[PDB]
Design a binder for this molecule. Structure first.
Ligand SMILES: [Fe+3]
Ligand SMILES: [Fe+3]
Lengths: 106, 106
């Protein structure tokens, strides 16, 4: 009923993924993209003081909300307008890009 | 130039997310969605034995490959055919959805 997923590394990737059909799960124990986006959001919060709020929710500690908004990877950002979800950004994005997303809804 | 990101939980989401434009970062320290998808992939590996291979790459430990394929959140699943990426699914999906994606390329 279960078979082990085969581990690949930078050293052997090109040899393992060469012929036929492979599905590769890019994963990690810790959330690197979550850490990368955090200071971006802190700078965005300062740039948008008074105009937009920036909040964070840990999905491992808060499964109910994470399930309600169908969060499937992390990080995922949901823009709310007056309590209603109006936009979604999946994964790390540069500050400039997130600003453009906020701007569309201000 | 940095402002603290306000924490929200299952308990207080209703009281905190209510008015104005509000961006919520759904994140975690550990990758809960990565943990949820692993047994699904193990079952898929058994179902597709001898037809497709299922592999995993830890992005923290393997920056070259993670960068080559522009992984921006996790988990990210990429389907390769004869060594070329032909399809991408971002985040946890149920087994039947993943099966449909492999079948398209088999
Ligand atoms: Fe800074
Ligand atoms: Fe900066």
């Amino acid at each position: 009923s279960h078979m082990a997923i085969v581990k690949v590394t930078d050293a052997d990737f090109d040899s393992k993924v060469e012929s036929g059909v492979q599905l590769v799960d890019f994963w990690a124990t810790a959330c690197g993209p979550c850490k990368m986006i955090a200071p971006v959001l802190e700078e965005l919060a300062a740039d948008y003081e008074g105009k937009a709020d920036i909040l964070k929710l840990d999905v491992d500690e808060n499964p109910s909300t994470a399930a309600k908004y169908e969060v499937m990877s992390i990080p995922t950002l949901i823009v709310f307008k007056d309590g209603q979800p109006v936009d979604k950004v999946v994964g790390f994005q540069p500050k400039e890009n997130l600003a453009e997303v906020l701007d569309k809804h201000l």
